[PDB]
Design an enzyme around this catalytic site. Structure first.
Site, PDB file in Angstrom:
ATOM      1  N   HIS A 305      -9.182   1.905  -8.371  1.00 18.37           N
ATOM      2  CA  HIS A 305      -9.339   2.979  -9.347  1.00 18.37           C
ATOM      3  C   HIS A 305     -10.012   2.395 -10.586  1.00 18.37           C
ATOM      4  O   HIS A 305      -9.643   1.308 -11.051  1.00 18.37           O
ATOM      5  CB  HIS A 305      -7.990   3.609  -9.728  1.00 18.37           C
ATOM      6  N   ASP A 362      -3.013   7.560  -4.406  1.00 18.30           N
ATOM      7  CA  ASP A 362      -3.490   8.402  -3.316  1.00 18.30           C
ATOM      8  C   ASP A 362      -3.301   7.755  -1.960  1.00 18.30           C
ATOM      9  O   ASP A 362      -3.212   8.449  -0.949  1.00 18.30           O
ATOM     10  CB  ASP A 362      -4.936   8.821  -3.544  1.00 18.30           C
TER      11      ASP A 362
END
Lengths: 426, 426, 142
Positions: A305, A362
């Site tokens: 990320h 996620d």
């Protein structure tokens, strides 16, 4: 203060600019009155420009910090529930029982969408991506709920805010049902937010649906962990559409499409191709999907990320919950366990270490949803449905500020004035 | 360029920043590196920040200069045609006969909208505002035209651009037909962009429709004069959403919502209605409609504009067109003494002269459209329709550049990290 | 022989040949083409059946579904033992198949259905219903 008094900008003579101080993070240089002189800054992507003053979410990426109204995300995920986090995000403080019960009652009171919108769902194709259908219905809400479009009226704004928090779960579940050809299920006032959503997703008239306690908690936590992520690309889209005065519903629709964004590529589904349709520790994570990484092929997959340096603070609780689900579902899970090999690689493999491809929130969210029997085409819909309260809060704060219309400058490098001479004839 | 090579910022250490120059307009101080140096500016609204480098449109607000690819708006509005202007905005040059022929050919072949998309219209309340139907329909396109959603893919932009380019007028005209209860009209290959539009808007299966060259050229001018307007709020939304990865149909649908944002902006929603009805040539001309100016909503009614100081350069050609159209429509434009009068009230009232509430392009466009029998609800639908080429040009430019994703900062002034301990038992 | 039919005859005459066992006299052929031409359209309700199939359906699955549903609509020509019912049924299928075939295609791509054109031959009428749009005149290439 370090060097936080004022500062000077020189070209020929000096210009004194005040520095604003944030309660957390870095302080900024005030340049609001610069453009009122002629001096403009140049910053594509806005990575060195504070776009607003906010009190909602604080993130210290390098420290892996995420706060919502000062509360650590890991505390909220564990000791709170989606609605209470929604209350906090919007109100700035945690609720009393009086405040919470009022908020909750109102939310459940408007969960049902107009009967005419259901007709709109059926005009869409059955093969359509649930996400596109979601964006489609959200952008059509203004055609119905036209009595709450005045972004300059706190009444309309609050009403729009509640209609969105109430109806989003209903909408999302209907997108799933439509895709699979199952009858739409109505919202239940007696079930929790997450318990109702699972029911609307999995219920059927064939028999009463039994919601597993562990699964309801899992889903609620997923919603909690996706409630907000600060000034990211999607929220900035929501904030910019809203700056012009765009209606509430239209604002969310743009945020939804923005969040859908990074998954439109080609090489993105070329790798997601193998990740989906195959189940074997000696198939996907073995010299096939691993080696097949061309454009993005990562964050969307659950690896890494741009915000956090070392780890995703949100992933911590999601990883624990994944244990409870994997343990509970067993007979509808133990086959998906190949996530440990994907995690092992994302931790012990050099390519994943070098690129800092740490399993984000996620990754675990995906493992759980996949185990619960949810198609990957509903994953981002679920995140968006959850992120909506965050979008609403940011949109509300942009308006509290006074709805500063986004009117950036530009560096023009095109043709100078030139006369137009046309020869064509068509 | 004199000292346009460099300059310096001074918080503590002398940070040297480039003074990037344009071919027209203001120079810009390259601050792209400041963020990494722990330095961030503060500019809600971006009025002192150049969000990008552009070659598309140039505007000098004080001097009333509007250039599209270097070409003055006057010359395009009087000499070119809408499709050629589209080619100019989209390709950066006046098309050779052949390039224009090929261009008109690609547009012509993609005019029809998928019949299933047509069924979506039947799910909207007949009584819906055509602009809400337009947002709903455009925001739903991505589910149907699912093969041109990869924004990174160069060929997908061609397809997407051409799709929106060709289909907007088909959808725009359908919004109207649907809003009045008449059958939809298919595009007619034998007609020009403007004529094709007037055909789809007004013809019925009951009699042959003959396109009037005057109204036709008058519409063509309304379109060109609304093709693009630099980095305004709605276009900034298009670039921002786009940089977020959102598919073209989503970014264009967002631009439409941001465009009509002021229409339902409360003060505009109420004042536009006041002007709507009052067409009695005793109130509008004799300071009744003018009696209410507490809440301005003037740009929307055709008076004043933040971009231009003394006049809107787009109104020159439009006023001249307006005078002509009124004549052409014979002895029917009698009650339109309010058009002559309101203009007089704008040029002579001390209040209007003080605030420079001059008639802009939309005061004149509104007259032409009203003279044509088009309802006011369809005015923004047409302006948004014409503006789509500008959006495609800006969205496309934003892509081919460097795809600098909108990731702004924020001045965090919220709560410092505090512990969470619920007050509820629910 | 198939060669002579494929090079010298036309589809409707071959139909007459298969259905009647002989090459049609000008008049018999005229009458035949007349009965076929007058039964080309499909009942509008049968047309609504197409809208209930997924747009993404294989046109052959839509064709089976539509043809298998015909009997409920053309309920008056279902007595196979009745000699006249076969005339009607045969002529119905004969005339309507290309209308339904072409509709399967139009539906599968998102374009509006095209009504038969009395002024065209069986082959030309088919190419018309398959490819023309309301946007421009379509000219059948010989």
């Amino acid at each position: 203060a370090d060097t936080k008094a004022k500062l000077t900008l020189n070209g020929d003579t000096a210009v004194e600019l005040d520095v604003l101080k944030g309660t957390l993070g870095q302080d900024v240089i005030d340049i609001r009155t610069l453009g009122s002189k002629g001096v403009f800054t140049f910053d594509p992507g806005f990575t060195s420009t504070a776009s607003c003053e906010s009190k909602i979410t604080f993130i210290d990426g390098d420290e892996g910090i995420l706060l919502h109204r000062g509360f650590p995300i890991d505390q909220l995920a564990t000791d709170s529930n989606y609605l209470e986090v929604c209350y906090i995000l919007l109100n700035g403080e945690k609720p009393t029982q009086e405040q919470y019960d009022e908020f909750k009652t109102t939310v459940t009171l408007h969960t049902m969408i107009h009967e005419q919108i259901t007709r709109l769902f059926h005009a869409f194709r059955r093969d359509s991506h649930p996400m596109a259908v979601m964006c489609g219905i959200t952008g059509a809400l203004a055609a119905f709920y036209h009595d709450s479009l005045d972004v300059n009226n706190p009444r309309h704004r609050e009403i729009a805010a509640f209609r969105l928090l109430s109806k989003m779960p209903t909408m999302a579940a209907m997108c799933y049902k439509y895709s699979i050809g199952q009858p739409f299920v109505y919202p239940r006032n007696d079930l929790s937010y997450a318990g109702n959503f699972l029911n609307m997703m999995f219920s059927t008239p064939c028999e009463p649906y039994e919601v597993n306690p562990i699964l309801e908690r899992a889903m609620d936590r997923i919603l909690i962990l996706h409630a907000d992520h600060e000034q990211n690309a999607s929220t900035s889209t929501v904030r910019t559409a809203g700056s012009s005065g765009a209606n509430p519903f239209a604002c969310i629709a743009a945020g939804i499409a923005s969040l859908w964004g990074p998954a439109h590529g080609g090489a993105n589904e070329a790798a997601l191709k193998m990740l989906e349709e195959i189940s074997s520790v000696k198939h996907i994570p073995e010299f096939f999907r691993r080696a097949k990484d061309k454009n993005d092929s990562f964050r969307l997959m659950g690896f890494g990320h741009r915000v956090y340096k070392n780890y995703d603070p949100r992933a911590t609780v999601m990883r624990e919950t994944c244990h409870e689900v994997l343990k509970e579902l067993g007979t509808k899970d133990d086959l998906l366990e190949v996530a440990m090999e994907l995690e092992n690689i994302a931790l012990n493999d050099p390519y994943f270490i070098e690129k800092k491809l740490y399993p984000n929130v996620d990754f675990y969210s995906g493992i759980i949803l996949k185990a619960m029997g949810i198609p990957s085409s509903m994953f981002t819909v679920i995140f968006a449905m959850a992120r909506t309260v965050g979008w609403i809060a940011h949109w509300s704060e942009m308006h509290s500020d006074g709805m500063k219309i986004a009117r950036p400058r530009q560096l023009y490098t095109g043709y100078e004035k030139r006369d137009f001479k046309s020869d064509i004839k068509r």
